[PDB]
Design a protein around this motif. Sequence first.
Motif, short mmCIF file in Angstrom:
data_model
loop_
_atom_site.label_atom_id
_atom_site.label_comp_id
_atom_site.label_asym_id
_atom_site.label_seq_id
_atom_site.Cartn_x
_atom_site.Cartn_y
_atom_site.Cartn_z
N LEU A 173 0.82 -1.20 0.00
CA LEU A 173 0.00 0.00 0.00
C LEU A 173 0.86 1.26 0.00
O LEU A 173 0.53 2.25 -0.66
CB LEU A 173 -0.94 0.00 1.20
N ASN A 174 1.96 1.24 0.75
CA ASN A 174 2.84 2.41 0.77
C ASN A 174 3.60 2.56 -0.54
O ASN A 174 4.05 3.67 -0.86
CB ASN A 174 3.81 2.31 1.94
N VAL A 175 3.77 1.48 -1.30
CA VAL A 175 4.42 1.59 -2.60
C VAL A 175 3.52 2.32 -3.59
O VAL A 175 3.98 3.19 -4.34
CB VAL A 175 4.83 0.20 -3.12
N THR A 176 2.23 1.98 -3.61
CA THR A 176 1.31 2.65 -4.52
C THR A 176 1.20 4.14 -4.21
O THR A 176 1.16 4.97 -5.12
CB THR A 176 -0.07 2.00 -4.47
N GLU A 177 1.15 4.49 -2.92
CA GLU A 177 1.12 5.90 -2.55
C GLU A 177 2.37 6.63 -3.02
O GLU A 177 2.33 7.84 -3.26
CB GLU A 177 0.96 6.05 -1.04
N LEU A 178 3.49 5.91 -3.15
CA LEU A 178 4.66 6.52 -3.78
C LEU A 178 4.48 6.62 -5.29
O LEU A 178 4.85 7.63 -5.90
CB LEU A 178 5.92 5.71 -3.44
N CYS A 179 3.91 5.58 -5.91
CA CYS A 179 3.68 5.62 -7.35
C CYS A 179 2.68 6.69 -7.73
O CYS A 179 2.84 7.36 -8.76
CB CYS A 179 3.22 4.25 -7.85
N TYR A 180 1.63 6.86 -6.93
CA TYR A 180 0.67 7.94 -7.18
C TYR A 180 1.34 9.30 -7.11
O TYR A 180 1.07 10.18 -7.93
CB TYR A 180 -0.48 7.86 -6.18
N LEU A 181 2.22 9.49 -6.12
CA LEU A 181 2.89 10.77 -5.96
C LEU A 181 4.02 10.95 -6.97
O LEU A 181 4.28 12.08 -7.41
CB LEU A 181 3.41 10.91 -4.53
N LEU A 182 4.71 9.87 -7.33
CA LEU A 182 5.86 9.99 -8.23
C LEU A 182 5.44 10.47 -9.61
O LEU A 182 6.11 11.33 -10.21
CB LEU A 182 6.60 8.66 -8.33
N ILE A 183 4.34 9.94 -10.15
CA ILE A 183 3.92 10.32 -11.49
C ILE A 183 3.40 11.75 -11.54
O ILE A 183 3.38 12.35 -12.62
CB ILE A 183 2.86 9.34 -12.04
N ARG A 184 2.98 12.31 -10.41
CA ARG A 184 2.48 13.68 -10.41
C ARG A 184 3.58 14.69 -10.67
O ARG A 184 3.40 15.61 -11.47
CB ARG A 184 1.79 13.98 -9.08
#
Lengths: 187, 199
Positions: A173-184
Amino acid sequence: WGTLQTILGGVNKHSTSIGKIWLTVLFIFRIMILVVAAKEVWGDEQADFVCNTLQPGCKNVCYDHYFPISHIRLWALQLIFVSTPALLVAMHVAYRRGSLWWTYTSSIFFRVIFEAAFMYVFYVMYDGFSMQRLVKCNAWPCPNTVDCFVSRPTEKTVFTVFMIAVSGICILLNVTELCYLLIRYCS
Amino acid sequence: WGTLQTILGGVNKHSTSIGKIWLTVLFIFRIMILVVAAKEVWGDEQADFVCNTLQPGCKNVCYDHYFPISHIRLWALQLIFVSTPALLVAMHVAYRRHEKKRKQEVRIEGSLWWTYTSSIFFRVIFEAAFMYVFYVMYDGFSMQRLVKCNAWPCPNTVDCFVSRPTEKTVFTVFMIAVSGICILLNVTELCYLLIRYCS
């Protein structure tokens, strides 16, 4: 603690979409499991530790050698370590109510590191996730090798797979929250 | 034994004036004391050996360290050793008497000199050797109530307590004193012979 609703609610308000799902995993499936079920399983960890010997002090050194840190004590330390980064950001957001990017990303990054470190410590220290019925011990003052027997090895194996699996989910779950923020920002 | 009167009587006939005194001190005050009284004093030597410890096997090794040979077993060996030179010569006296009759105070004339003198000399040496072993191994003739033991597997030093040390000391002094009397009696018989031949 009677203020659990306030502090959990405070984190709930200052959280994103996934961040609210992550909070229900940490509290319901990890804190409650460690409090209502697991803490009593480990109650007689040393009291019901049985060694086939007549040597005084042999039981003490053998239990110490094979359980340097209790499982429930490890999970209590891990829970606190993965709780400060979330609350510190949550308090900062309340104070703010820009620079939030460097804190929110850091807290997620710290939580992933802490959760992977504890899982690594669990595996290397306890040579797997399965508790054995019999431990063979040869530390002083035990003569030769002494057979010893663990209290509730199967109960402890079930609850340690449950806690490790949930911690594995918290990593994802913490990886996806990084992926959501990284692409922004950088993508 | 039912033949004790036979062997004691036989040895009594083939002896000198002093040698008959030596027979009473040996049998009455050494064999009887050992059999009637001393042996049951030592009967429980290891059973009531008590050590202040929880270590398995510590009592076994501490008793073994401090009593490698029992007192009564040491006295039994000594009695056997000092009895053979007397009995062998007494048997040889019968054979010499047998030859003369086939052709009651014992007198040493010919080859009996080198047997009788050697038998007296051997008994002095055997008694002194056992008296020396008693002193060296047990650092004196007094049993102590407490012994301190640190042989493996005993942790550090362990306190251990002996059964009936005072009664054992009393009988030890008695046996050593009588043994010294026998040595003195034997030396006099050497003096009696040494002034007959070489003086």
